RNA sequence: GAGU
DNA sequence: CCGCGTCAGACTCGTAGGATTATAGCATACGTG
DNA sequence: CACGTATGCTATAATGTGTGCAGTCTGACGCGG
């Protein structure tokens, strides 16, 4: 692919394949020319080397390196290990409708609630806002709805307030060691950029407010929303699944 | 042991995704093994329903 | 160490007491950063087999 | 005290007279790089060293050769300032004089054939700034010193390698600075082996055979002798009493006529001493005893001439009888013992498959070049080129020195190539260690770890560039013509320039200077890293090296190192520590002679320190006599205990020398746990400078030093009176006594105004002098970004109360008063940089016009004709900063757009829209704009306007220069003319332009006039050329990247006020996030009515054991109490006398206050300015371990009429009722850290997706989604939330069809899931098939 | 066992005997006359020359073995085009072929995006010229400085230097830390987000609704001609041929339908005007 | 570099 | 048994872009506007 | 015919690589001699 600045950027595989093709096509030439057998041999070894590099580089011997010194990334490296397909892109994924911020206390909150910054919530619920805008007849089209939310009009705040009622959101803190590291709450919209977390579930998150941050996720479907409110809501999940003990305890 | 028990499951997608993936795949490719996708791992990889 | 720290924090440690404290402190802190990998790896293997 | 100290004196609670002042803090950086460029004539250093190392070089043929003469750095074409603006590297061109000499092949070495000598350019080398940074591509960057294992010898042993046996296997390693490693090691069978570069293992004696040692000689080297004389018929043995020790007497040991030991009897001490005293030398012994003694030398039958026994061969009854009858009645056998003198080499010769020297060379050759046919040539060449070639091997002076001292030699310096003795001696010491005498070293000991600063590293990379070019040179010399070929035609600059640019750029050690704070810069430049090239890896690092080592005392801080994976490896330098000339660390100590503690100071290296017993600084001195107390607390051999007074050799200079610079800034460090203090010192570096530079009430004293030494403050070069103060500059006229007789003698300092830092903070210099003030040399004229009157001002002190409050300070959460925000004291400036690039594409050039399709007039209002926003303009997210348009190619317009464009006509123009706009939800004021056009592209109208400014402003700057220089220069001539022909006002009457024609009598003062006259014209012509240069540079059309026609840089300035989510902390590792900003009405308030500023949770004290914060608060309140008393007195205006009485008593409070500060020297007005400053709160210095004691602090509180508890009655602002018990209240000095919630908040519904995997990108700058990782997935599995999981795997990530369908469903209300297959899975299969594994889906 | 490809090959070449002049001449006479052995013996005996030369040309083009094979190809051309009758030695002649072939190979394969020889050689002279310029100008050379030296267009120089822009690996990780690389940042720009895709659905569907507002005749004419509800953008003759002969009448009804759409827009255009972004 |  | 090899080694967040070298000179040949 | 891209040939003799780094990590579990 071309970078903006007229540079090109390519996969290492292309370099590896260029080696193989060149060596194989040279072999065909050497055979057409009926070359002496020692040269035929060297080329056959050459071919095997390049193929081995293509499939799994640093397996048989010295991995074939770039100008950077670093061994080129072969096919097997894309399947193999943490950088590999499975671990990195398949068993765990990047996710839309996800946000993050600093967390701070919400002593006023009840157990099933969390402070959700307005700005953040406006973006997370974008399509829900556009859909409701079209039912209000406020937005003629999607382009108009978009421009209406950019301008952040006062009717949009009323609509946003409407949508987020009864809609659970998931809060997560890293590392997610047990299931209670992800819990669902009813969001309470707040002006100001930090998430407010309820004190009593700080236990389960191991959250202390020395600058800790948390991630927010929007359950989209009726099914996911139900899963969140029923299975994952903080009020519903009190006891440690490990020992039969209440994990929400005053501290 | 835990490591070998996971590698011993009939599901080769679960096995390969766990560890040892070059070896797991040569084993399965030679055996002509088929995974009918009973486990959660396997379903999550293909983005299906647990 | 053969010599213990006779002082307390309200009293305030001298150079030598403070220096002597450092070793243990830092050993602990390093353990947090580095050993959590091995603990977590245990978590991962258990998870995979169950 | 100095003039600046008269303005505000800090109160010192220290008691220990400071014998040694803190050095220049940025010594390391500067001294090092100074040595790198310093051209040393003999003792090659840096550059000079690199040239001599490589040069002179000759061709492959040997007839033509290049020799080095001398180098010179050109002065930098662009100064630092311009470099930062343009984005260029500040460097000097390296021109080197070189001489191409050719030899005749017909004559033996006909040097008078062809000699061509000329100057060749080869790379620009970056220069170091005044403060130890480099300017690389317009950004300040610091290369951090490295810490590695010193070249030399090192003996080690894995304590029970094979855990089964658990036998200790000792090894030697010789580590050179450049070359192969040479390892000696024992195996379980006690045989000595050798390996090169950990290749395969070889018998150790094989290496000695390579050095041409026969077997006989090898035994003679390592072993002793046991002599056997064969007399008459009985066998006699030559005896050394102290060999037969710890052994069992095998036969009946007797001498002349006295039987000592019997058969099977233990030979103790008594026996040995008996025998020695009796003078026993020969002893009759049994012949059968010989069987098993190893013969040392060869013996041949002189008759036959054949070998009776070869060397190193076990003797027997037959061999011995045969030897006797041939005529040998004396036989050298080896002395050997299982316990003391172990027979290692004897056994190793039996395992040695080689025979002679040549055979040994072949085996060596065959190890490292296996399979390949050996030739004698090749074997000889290889072995010599390993450790015996000048070119490829070099221990360096450090290596040889360390090696010689480890071998207990006398001579320090010597050859960097291994001599035969060297090798043998390492083997011998290894063997000594095996026998039991000697010990193995440790790597973590600072005697074995060496510090490698910038200069030496630059030197190394520069050698490499030379070596690359050397290859090219040799190859081209060989083929080259002798006559036509010039030397500079063979040399290429590119390899060298590349290697150096790569170092100051690609290297780990070279990084963006951390400049969000003066302290941050200073400590960063004082950092040491064990990482990087030739160092340890985060993954390769154990815990041994990481933890705090005994040798670190006084050299490295134990309390300053990151809590990350970089925990052990990155470390800050201790205060008084310094780099030894060879590269080891060293610390000052005061020598104690006869108990008497001299003021002579000695820097001790790590190794030297172990030898002496060193008293602690806390010992009480007997007023320059000796130690008061008979028992003194000291340390040696890395361990601490009591000693007598006369036993003491040295003593610690300062109480601070144990700690680093950062840690020293922590007051009451003595009362804080080291863990917390680590975090405290680390977090102090992250303090963001506020709008208003507030000094810290409760300081330490290091504040002044840091600020001044960092160089961020403007300091005065020469004392004198200030001629012109200004926001933008300071002109000071120098005192006659310091003022040189040449120039006018007026110093001019232009101050650097509102400039962008690397962390997007705001760097502005303020003047801290009044107009017409007399100022002393080395006073602070202008404060840097986080400095106040010369002191370091990182944060701001404020009124704190420790108490819970409605959970709003739950777990370190912080409740702050609105008052703090209103007063804008924590408010901060951030200057961000936005650039708009106009590139030339395949379709045609992008243009920077304001003519863009579909833009509102509201938008174009703030843009000028050119399409650039005006200076001053306030912007908010979405506003266009620089308008830019791009040529669009053909696009197949959907039939809908065909229909619609037919309906409206409005055919869409050829041009798109790539305009640079304000990033969303950032908002500020455009404070500067800069335009870069290429050399030939027609300039923007706006670019011309900017150039107009620059030209006219440049002219003013230079004109003011010659104006104030001409004024100060004639003012001198006026005074010289008075000394002789005084006509003061009569000379000023007729014009000053006709003045220098007037002379004096022929004296020294007439010559002074000639000197001022010559300089005045010099300045006249100089001013012409300077301005021409200025004009060129302004006109100069910039060389940008290929493809880029022109670039516009906009600088926004944003004012950020604190809010909930921001991060705040003290210096004791006490963090917190702001939870809530409370109205002032609600804040807890004291009886007097004064409300608290912050309410911190006291639950974060006992557990944490950071008690420094509590003492800081108490002392803080006392500091303020005195401030309020002075303030009350100033409001009433009692009089000078009364103020002075109170203030003297106050300064001189403490039990053993070191500093006396007599107010009788101060004149009345000096007292007034001082009190004026002290009214805010009297500033106090608590040194590190030498701090203020509880008693002293409570006495200060009584002077404030404040309680001894330091707790006060507080009232709840909401109710008006008092809290149940007294609350601890005072001033803690707090900081706002760089972690603004503004930068951390992020949210995303839908956006761009990744290229191959199709899942959303990561990071807030790329508008990324969060990763829901394996850990996060497991959570949902546990819960059983199946659809939420699937949702995140599919519609929210890869599933392309699914995401779009889901979006449309969501807009239509119906929250239906329409899932498919993740594209990343598809890709997996394809990847597997490209591997050549058939992986197919069998469908239903 | 030495399994080094290189070492094995070098050993095998070593065990073939070096030739004298008379031998080369005899062999080569028969080689031109076709003696399979002769050609083979000359090749195999002179492999060692090839390795000496490939040793030099390596450096930064390519792997030593890759250079050796291309070099061998040059040597084969030399054995085919050798003249025994000319007194000039073989090694001298072969050297030319070997160097030629290696250099040409490292000019087409050395670059990921294959640069033609012409471009490459142009560019090289710009480079060597830049080096002389930098040798006297201390500082590196500008595009226009090099262009002034060659007396040529700056655009020429610039375009050449743009081609010399060497590739970046997508897999190379950024920030020293082996974490996320270029691929990890790099979006798919072609693939629009569900927001853009859903906006087009909304657009296209609003046009259906607007088309139904019009007359059945106008709407059908517009649909068929625009290729909107039809398949192919039927020309005037196609639409007329299927409905009303008069090709001219298709234009009449079409233009009429466009103007009725404009009326709907002046009335209810309050939604349409916002589609201008 | 941030919280574990 | 020994010794050499291969395999594993927590989770989210951040920052910043980026590097190098060099391939002669000319004559003939093939494909598209 | 021209422009862009390609193939081609050259004659003093020259005839076996190396090059630039790697820094050593660890506790475990199998696999040829
Ligand atoms: Mg906590
Ligand atoms: Mg925390």
Residue D638: CATH number of its domain: 2.30.150.10
Q: DSSP letters of E29-43?
A: HHHHT--HHHHHHHH
Q: DSSP letters of A164-220?
A: HTT--EEEE-SS--SGGGEEEEEEEEESSSSEEE-GGGHHHHT--TTT-EEEEE---
Q: CB of A177 within 8 A of CB of C43? A: yes
Question: What are E218's two structure tokens?
Answer: 């106008």
Find all residues with CB under 8 Å of D310, minimum gap 6, and list them.
Answer: D215, D298
Q: CB of D304 within 8 A of CB of D207? A: no
Which phi and psi (to 5°) does residue D1256 adopt? -55, 150
> D1029 and D886 share a domain?
yes
Give residue A176's Cα distance to chain centre: 15
Among D1015, D1040, D1055, residue at a domain's last position: D1055
Which of these, D555, D649, D643, lies nearest to D611 by C-alpha position? D649
CATH of residue D730: 2.40.50.100
> E56 and E78 share a domain?
yes
Q: Do D1256 and A101 touch (CB under 8 A)?
A: no
The protein residue nearest nucleotide G2, judged by CA to C1', is D162
Q: CB of D527 within 8 A of CB of D157? A: no
Window 1-40 of chain C: CB closer than 7 A to strand F: 32-33, 36
Residue D360 CA to residue D212 CA, distance in Å, equals 9
> E160 and E222 share a domain?
no
Q: Which of D74, D493, D1307 sits opposite E134 (nearest CB)?
A: D493
> E183 and E242 share a domain?
no
Residue D592 CA to residue D605 CA, distance in Å, equals 17
> E167 and E214 share a domain?
no
Please work out, in degrees rounded to the nearest 5, the angle formed at the alpha carbon of residue D835 by the alpha carbons of D831 and D837: 175
Question: What are D262's two structure tokens?
Answer: 């019997």
Residue D698 CA to residue A37 CA, distance in Å, equals 86
Which of these, D29, D3, D813, D1042, lies nearest to D451 by C-alpha position? D29
> E99 and E184 share a domain?
no
CB of D563 lies under 7 Å from some atom of strand F:
yes
Q: CB of D412 within 8 A of CB of D404? A: yes
Q: CB of D109 within 8 A of CB of D79? A: no
Chosen from C44, C46, C47, C48 to mutate, greatest number of chain B CBs within 10 A: C48
> D532 and D680 share a domain?
yes
Tell how many helices (H) and how many strands (E) occur in chain A: 10, 8
Chain E environment of D1250 (Cβ under 8 Å): 183-184, 186-188
Q: Do C26 and D547 touch (CB under 8 A)?
A: yes
Among E191, E211, E243, residue at a domain's last position: E191
> D867 and D948 share a domain?
yes
Resolution in A: 3.6
> D1145 and D1272 share a domain?
no
> E6 and E108 share a domain?
yes
Which of these, D413, D416, D501, lies nearest to D462 by C-alpha position? D501
Nearest ligand to the CA of A209 is 2
Residue D332 CA to residue D295 CA, distance in Å, equals 6
Overall number of domains in chain E: 3
- From A227's Cα to the closest Cα of chain D, the distance in A is 6
Chain C environment of B16 (Cβ under 8 Å): none
> D911 and D859 share a domain?
yes
> D681 and D622 share a domain?
no
Which contacts (CB < 8 Å, 24+ apart) does range D241-246 have?
D241/D272, D241/D273, D241/D275, D241/D276, D241/D280, D242/D272, D242/D276, D243/D335, D243/D337, D244/D271, D244/D272, D245/D272, D245/D340, D246/D339
Which of these, D981, D1024, D1032, lies nearest to D1006 by C-alpha position? D981
> D353 and D421 share a domain?
yes
CA distances from D593 to C17, D624, D1115, E138 (A): 27, 12, 40, 59
> D1026 and D984 share a domain?
yes
Q: Do E275 and A143 touch (CB under 8 A)?
A: yes
Find all residues with CB under 8 Å of A25, minimum gap 6, and list them.
Answer: none
Q: With 0-12 CB in 10 A as exposed, 13-18 as middle and 19+ as buried, what is A210?
A: middle
Q: CB of D118 within 8 A of CB of D98? A: yes
Containing structural domain, residue D642: 588-654
Q: With 0-12 CB in 10 A as exposed, 13-18 as middle and 19+ as buried, what is A242?
A: exposed
Give residue B46's Cα distance to chain centre: 12
User: CA(A246)–C1'(H23) in Å?
Assistant: 52
Chosen from D491, D1262, D1300, D1316 to mutate, greatest number of chain E CBs within 10 A: D1300
Question: What are D711's two structure tokens?
Answer: 């160089």
Tell how many helices (H) and how many strands (E) occur in chain B: 4, 0
Q: What's the distance, Cα to Cα, between the start and end of chain A in Å?
A: 55
Task: Give the three-state DSSP class for D414.
Answer: coil
Containing structural domain, residue E137: 115-191
Chain E environment of D1302 (Cβ under 8 Å): 194
Among E191, E207, E240, residue at a domain's last position: E191
> E166 and E153 share a domain?
yes
User: CA(A30)–C1'(G26) in Å?
Assistant: 29
Among E173, E191, E209, residue at a domain's last position: E191
Q: Do E200 and D895 touch (CB under 8 A)?
A: no
Chain A environment of D1303 (Cβ under 8 Å): 127
> D894 and D782 share a domain?
no
Q: Which nucleotide is nearest to E107 (CA to C1')?
A: G23
Residue with the two structure tokens 């998931």: A170
> E154 and E125 share a domain?
yes
> D577 and D602 share a domain?
no
CA distances from A53 to A9, A18, A60, E108, E266 (A): 21, 12, 8, 22, 67
Q: Which nucleotide is nearest to D497 (CA to C1')?
A: G20
Overall number of domains in chain D: 7
Looking at chain A, which residue has its C-alpha nearest residue E274?
A144
Find all residues with CB under 8 Å of D338, minimum gap 6, and list them.
Answer: none
Question: What are D793's two structure tokens?
Answer: 């001002």
Chain D environment of E48 (Cβ under 8 Å): none
Find all residues with CB under 8 Å of D101, minimum gap 6, and list them.
Answer: D64, D65, D66, D67, D111, D114, D115
Window 1065-1104 of chain D: CB closer than 7 A to strand F: 1071
Q: Which residues of A are annotated as a binding site?
A: 208, 210, 212
Chosen from E138, E139, E165, E203 to mutate, greatest number of chain D CBs within 10 A: E138
Kindly give the interhelix angle for E64-80 and E47-57, rounded to the nearest 10 degrees.
Answer: 130
CA distances from C18 to C11, C22, D510, D670, D759 (A): 12, 7, 33, 7, 34
Give residue D132's Cα distance to chain centre: 11
Q: Which nucleotide is nearest to C35 (CA to C1')?
A: G10
3-state DSSP helix/strand/coil % of chain B, to nearest 5: 60, 0, 40
> E78 and E129 share a domain?
no
Give the Å distance between the CA of A205 and the centre of ligand 2.
10
Task: Give the three-state DSSP class for A241.
Answer: coil
> D674 and D817 share a domain?
no
Q: Do E138 and D900 touch (CB under 8 A)?
A: no
Chain D environment of C19 (Cβ under 8 Å): 548, 553, 558, 658
Which phi and psi (to 5°) does residue A171 adopt? -110, 135
Widest Cα–Cα separation across chain D: 137
Q: With 0-12 CB in 10 A as exposed, 13-18 as middle and 19+ as buried, what is D151?
A: buried
Q: Do B22 and A56 touch (CB under 8 A)?
A: yes
> E186 and E196 share a domain?
no
Tally A–E CB contacts below 8 A: 112
Q: Does B28 touch chain A (CB under 8 A)?
A: no
Q: Which nucleotide is nearest to D372 (CA to C1')?
A: H16
> E183 and E204 share a domain?
no
Q: CB of D1225 within 8 A of CB of D1208? A: yes
Q: Does E12 touch chain A (CB under 8 A)?
A: yes
> E200 and E275 share a domain?
yes
Q: Does A85 touch chain E (CB under 8 A)?
A: no
């Amino acid at each position: 692919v071309p970078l903006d600045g007229g540079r090109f950027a390519t996969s290492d595989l292309n370099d590896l394949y260029r080696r193989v093709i060149n060596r194989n096509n040279r072999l065909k030439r050497l055979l057409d020319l009926a070359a002496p057998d020692i040269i035929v041999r060297n080329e056959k070894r050459m071919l095997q080397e390049a193929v081995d590099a293509l499939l799994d580089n640093g397996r048989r011997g010295r991995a074939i390196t770039g100008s950077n010194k670093r061994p080129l990334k072969s096919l097997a490296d894309m399947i193999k290990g943490k950088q590999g397909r499975f671990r990195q892109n398949l068993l765990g994924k990047r996710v839309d409708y996800s946000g993050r911020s600093v967390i701070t206390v919400g002593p006023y909150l009840r157990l099933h609630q969390c402070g959700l910054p307005k700005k953040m919530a406006l973006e997370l619920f974008k399509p829900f806002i556009y859909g409701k805008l079209e039912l209000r007849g406020l937005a003629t089209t999607i382009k108009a709805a978009k421009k209406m939310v950019e301008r952040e009009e006062a009717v949009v705040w009323d609509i946003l307030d409407e949508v987020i009622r009864e809609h659970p959101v998931l809060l997560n803190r890293a590392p997610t060691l047990h299931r209670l590291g992800i819990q669902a709450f009813e969001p309470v919209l707040i002006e100001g950029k930090a998430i407010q977390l309820h004190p009593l579930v700080c236990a389960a998150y191991n959250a202390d407010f020395d600058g800790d941050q948390m991630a927010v996720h929007v359950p989209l479907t009726l099914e996911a929303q139900l899963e969140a409110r029923a299975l994952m809501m903080s009020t519903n999940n009190i006891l440690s699944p490990a020992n039969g003990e209440p994990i929400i305890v005053p501290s | 042991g835990i490591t070998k028990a996971s590698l011993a499951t009939e599901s080769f997608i679960s096995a390969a995704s766990f560890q040892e993936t070059t070896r797991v795949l040569t084993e399965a490719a030679v055996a002509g093994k088929r995974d009918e996708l009973r486990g959660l791992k396997e379903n999550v990889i293909v983005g299906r329903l647990i | 160490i053969e010599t213990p720290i006779t002082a307390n924090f309200r009293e305030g440690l001298n150079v030598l007491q403070y220096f002597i404290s450092t070793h243990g402190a830092r050993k602990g802190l390093a353990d947090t950063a580095l050993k959590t990998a091995n603990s977590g790896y245990l978590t991962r293997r258990l998870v995979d087999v169950a | 005290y100095s003039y600046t100290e008269k303005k505000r004196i800090r109160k010192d609670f220290g008691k220990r007279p400071q014998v040694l002042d803190v050095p220049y803090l940025l010594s390391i950086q500067l001294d090092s790089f100074q040595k790198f460029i310093e051209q040393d004539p003999e003792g090659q250093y840096g550059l000079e060293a690199a040239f001599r190392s490589v040069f002179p070089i000759q061709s492959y043929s040997g007839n033509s050769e290049l020799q080095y003469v001398s180098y010179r750095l050109g002065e930098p074409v662009f100064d630092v300032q311009e470099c930062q603006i343009r984005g260029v590297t500040y460097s000097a061109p390296l021109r080197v004089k070189l001489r191409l000499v050719i030899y005749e092949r017909e004559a033996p070495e006909g040097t008078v054939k062809d000699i061509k000598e000329q100057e060749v350019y080869m790379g620009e080398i970056p220069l170091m700034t005044d403060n130890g940074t480099f300017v690389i591509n317009g950004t300040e960057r610091v290369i951090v010193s490295q810490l590695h294992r010193s070249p030399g010898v090192f003996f080690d042993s894995d304590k029970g390698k094979t855990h089964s046996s658990g036998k200790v296997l000792y090894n030697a390693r010789i580590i050179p600075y450049r070359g192969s490693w040479l390892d000696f090691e024992f195996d379980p069978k006690d045989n000595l082996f050798v390996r090169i570069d950990r290749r395969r293992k070889l018998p150790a004696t094989i290496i000695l055979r390579a050095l041409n040692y026969t077997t006989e000689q090898i035994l003679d080297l390592f072993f002793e002798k046991v002599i056997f004389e064969i007399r008459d018929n009985k066998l006699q043995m030559e005896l050394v009493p102290e060999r037969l020790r710890g052994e069992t007497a095998s036969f009946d040991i007797e001498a002349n006529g006295k039987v000592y030991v019997e058969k099977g009897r233990r030979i103790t001490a008594r026996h040995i001493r008996q025998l020695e005293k009796d003078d026993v030398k020969l002893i009759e012994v049994p012949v059968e005893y010989i069987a098993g003694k190893v013969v040392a030398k060869d013996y041949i039958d002189e008759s036959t001439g054949e070998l009776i026994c070869a060397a190193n061969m076990e003797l027997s009854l037959d061999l011995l009888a045969k030897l006797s009858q041939s005529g040998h009645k004396r036989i050298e056998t080896l002395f050997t013992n299982d316990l003391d003198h172990g027979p290692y080499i004897s056994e190793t010769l039996r395992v040695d498959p080689t025979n002679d020297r040549l055979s040994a060379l072949v085996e060596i050759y065959r190890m490292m070049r296996p399979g390949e046919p050996p030739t004698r040539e090749a074997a000889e060449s290889l072995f010599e080129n390993l450790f015996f070639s000048e070119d490829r091997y070099d221990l360096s002076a450090v290596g040889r020195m360390k090696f010689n001292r480890s071998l207990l030699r006398e001579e320090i310096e010597g050859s960097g190539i291994l001599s035969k003795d060297d090798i043998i001696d390492v083997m011998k010491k290894l063997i000594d260690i095996r026998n039991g005498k000697g010990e193995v070293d440790d790597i973590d000991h600072l005697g074995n770890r060496r510090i490698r600063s910038v200069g030496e590293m630059a030197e190394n990379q520069f050698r490499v560039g030379l070596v690359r070019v050397e290859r090219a040179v040799k190859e081209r010399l060989s083929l080259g013509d002798l006559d036509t070929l010039m030397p500079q035609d063979m040399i290429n600059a590119k390899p060298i320039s590349a290697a150096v640019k790569e170092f100051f750029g690609s290297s780990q050690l070279s990084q963006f200077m951390d400049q969000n704070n003066p302290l941050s810069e200073i400590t960063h430049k004082r950092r040491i890293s064990a990482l990087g090239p030739g160092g340890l890896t985060r993954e390769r690092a154990g815990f041994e090296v990481r933890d705090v080592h005994p040798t670190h005392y006084g050299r490295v801080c134990p309390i300053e190192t990151p809590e990350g994976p970089n925990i052990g490896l990155i470390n800050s330098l201790s205060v008084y520590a310094q780099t030894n000339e060879y590269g080891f660390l060293e610390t000052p100590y005061r020598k104690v002679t006869d108990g008497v503690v001299t003021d002579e100071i000695h820097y001790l290296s790590a190794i030297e320190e172990g030898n002496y017993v060193i008293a602690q600084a806390n010992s009480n001195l007997d007023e320059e006599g000796h130690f008061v107390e008979d028992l003194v607390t000291c340390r040696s051999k890395g361990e601490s205990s009591l000693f007598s007074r006369d036993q003491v050799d040295y003593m610690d200079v300062s109480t601070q020398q144990v700690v680093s610079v950062g840690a020293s800034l922590i007051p009451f460090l003595e009362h804080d746990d080291a863990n917390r203090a680590l975090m405290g010192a680390n977090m102090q570096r992250q303090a963001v400078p506020t709008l208003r530079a507030d000094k810290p009430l409760v300081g330490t004293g290091m504040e002044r030093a840091v600020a001044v030494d960092s160089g961020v403050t403007a300091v005065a070069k020469r004392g004198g009176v200030v001629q012109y103060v200004d926001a933008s500059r300071i002109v000071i006229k120098v005192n006659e006594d310091e003022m040189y007789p040449g120039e006018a003698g007026i110093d001019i300092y232009n101050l650097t105004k509102y400039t962008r830092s690397n962390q997007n903070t705001c760097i502005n210099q303020m003047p801290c002098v009044s107009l017409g003030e007399p100022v002393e040399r080395g006073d602070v004229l202008a404060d840097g970004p986080s400095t106040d009157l010369g002191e370091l001002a990182l944060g701001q002190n404020m009124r704190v109360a420790f108490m819970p409050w409605n959970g709003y300070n739950f777990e370190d959460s912080i409740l702050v008063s609105e008052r703090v925000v209103q007063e804008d004291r924590f408010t901060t400036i951030h200057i961000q940089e936005l650039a708009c690039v106009s590139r030339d594409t395949k379709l045609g050039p992008e243009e920077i016009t304001a003519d863009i399709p579909n833009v509102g007039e509201a938008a174009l209002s703030k843009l000028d004709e050119s399409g650039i926003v005006y200076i001053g303009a306030e912007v908010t997210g979405g506003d266009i900063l620089v308008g830019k348009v791009t040529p669009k190619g053909e696009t197949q317009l959907t039939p809908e757009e065909k229909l619609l464009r037919a309906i409206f006509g409005e055919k869409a123009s050829d041009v798109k829209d790539s305009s640079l706009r304000v990033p969303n939800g950032v908002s500020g004021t455009v404070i500067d704009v800069q335009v870069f056009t290429r050399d030939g592209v027609e300039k923007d109208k706006r670019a011309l306007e900017i150039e107009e400014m620059q030209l006219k402003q440049a002219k003013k700057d230079l004109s003011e220069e010659l104006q104030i220089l001409e004024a100060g220069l004639f003012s001198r001539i006026r005074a010289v003319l008075v000394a002789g022909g005084v006509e003061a006002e009569k000379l000023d009457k007729l014009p000053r332009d006709r003045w220098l024609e007037l002379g004096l009598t022929d004296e020294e003062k007439q010559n002074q006039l000639e000197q001022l006259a010559e300089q005045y014209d010099e300045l006249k012509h100089e001013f012409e050329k300077k301005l021409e240069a200025k004009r060129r540079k302004i006109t100069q059309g910039d060389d940008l990247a290929p493809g880029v026609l022109k670039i516009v840089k906009v600088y926004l300035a944003v004012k950020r006020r604190i809010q909930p989510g921001d991060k705040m902390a003290g210096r004791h590792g006490n963090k917190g996030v702001i939870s809530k900003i409370n109205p002032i009405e609600d804040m807890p308030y004291d009886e007097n009515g004064t409300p608290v500023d912050i309410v911190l949770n006291p639950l974060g004290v006992p557990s944490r054991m950071n008690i420094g914060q509590i003492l800081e608060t108490h002392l803080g309140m006392a500091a303020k109490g005195i401030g309020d008393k002075i303030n009350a007195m100033l409001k009433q205006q009692q009089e000078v006398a009364k103020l002075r009485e109170f203030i003297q008593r106050a300064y001189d409070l403490g039990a053993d206050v070191r500093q006396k500060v007599d107010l009788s020297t101060f004149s009345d007005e000096e007292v007034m300015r001082l009190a004026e400053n002290l009214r805010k709160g009297m500033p106090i210095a608590t040194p590190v371990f030498d701090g203020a004691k509880e008693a002293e602090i409570k006495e200060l509180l009584k002077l404030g009429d404040l309680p001894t508890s330091g707790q006060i009655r507080l009232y709840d602002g909401r109710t008006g009722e008092q809290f149940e018990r007294p609350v601890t209240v005072g001033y803690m000095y707090m900081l706002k850290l760089n972690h603004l919630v503004d930068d951390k908040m992020h949210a995303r519904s839908t956006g761009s997706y990744s290229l191959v995997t199709q899942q959303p990108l990561g990071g807030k700058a790329q508008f990324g989604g969060q990763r829901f990782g394996e850990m996060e997935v497991w959570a949902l599995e546990a819960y059983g939330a199946a659809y939420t999981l699937q949702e995140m795997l599919t519609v929210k990530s890869d599933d392309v069809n699914g995401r779009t369908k889901m979006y449309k469903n969501i807009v239509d209300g119906n929250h239906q899931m329409e899932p498919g297959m993740p594209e990343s899975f598809n890709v997996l299969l394809k990847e597997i098939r490209s591997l050549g594994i058939n992986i197919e889906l069998e469908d239903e | 066992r030495v399994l080094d490809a290189t070492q094995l090959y070098l050993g095998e070449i070593g065990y073939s005997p070096l030739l004298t002049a008379e031998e080369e001449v005899y062999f080569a006479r028969r080689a031109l006359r076709g003696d399979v052995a002769s050609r083979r013996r000359m090749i195999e005996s002179n492999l060692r020359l090839v390795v000496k030369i490939a040793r030099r040309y390596g450096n930064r083009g390519l792997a030593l073995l890759d250079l050796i094979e291309e070099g061998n190809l040059g040597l084969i051309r030399a054995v085919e085009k050798f003249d025994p009758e000319r007194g000039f030695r073989f090694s001298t002649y072969a050297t030319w072929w070997i160097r030629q072939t290696i250099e040409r190979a490292i000019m087409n394969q050395t670059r990921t995006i294959r640069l033609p020889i012409h471009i490459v050689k142009e560019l090289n002279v710009y480079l060597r010229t830049a080096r002389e310029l930098s040798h006297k100008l201390d500082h590196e050379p500008s595009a226009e400085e090099i262009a002034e030296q060659l007396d040529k267009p700056v655009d020429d120089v610039s375009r050449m230097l743009r081609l010399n822009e060497r590739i970046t690996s997508v897999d190379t990780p950024l920030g020293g830390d082996s974490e996320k690389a270029l691929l990890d940042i790099l979006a798919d720009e072609k693939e629009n987000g569900p927001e853009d895709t859903t906006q087009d659905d909304d657009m296209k569907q609003s046009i259906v609704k607007w088309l139904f507002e019009l007359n059945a005749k106008q709407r059908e004419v517009l649909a068929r001609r625009f290729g909107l509800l039809g398949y192919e953008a039927a020309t005037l003759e196609d639409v007329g041929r299927e409905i009303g002969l008069t090709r001219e009448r298709v234009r009449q009804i079409q233009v009429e339908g466009l103007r009725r759409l404009r009326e709907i827009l002046q009335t209810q255009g309050l939604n349409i005007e916002a589609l201008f972004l």
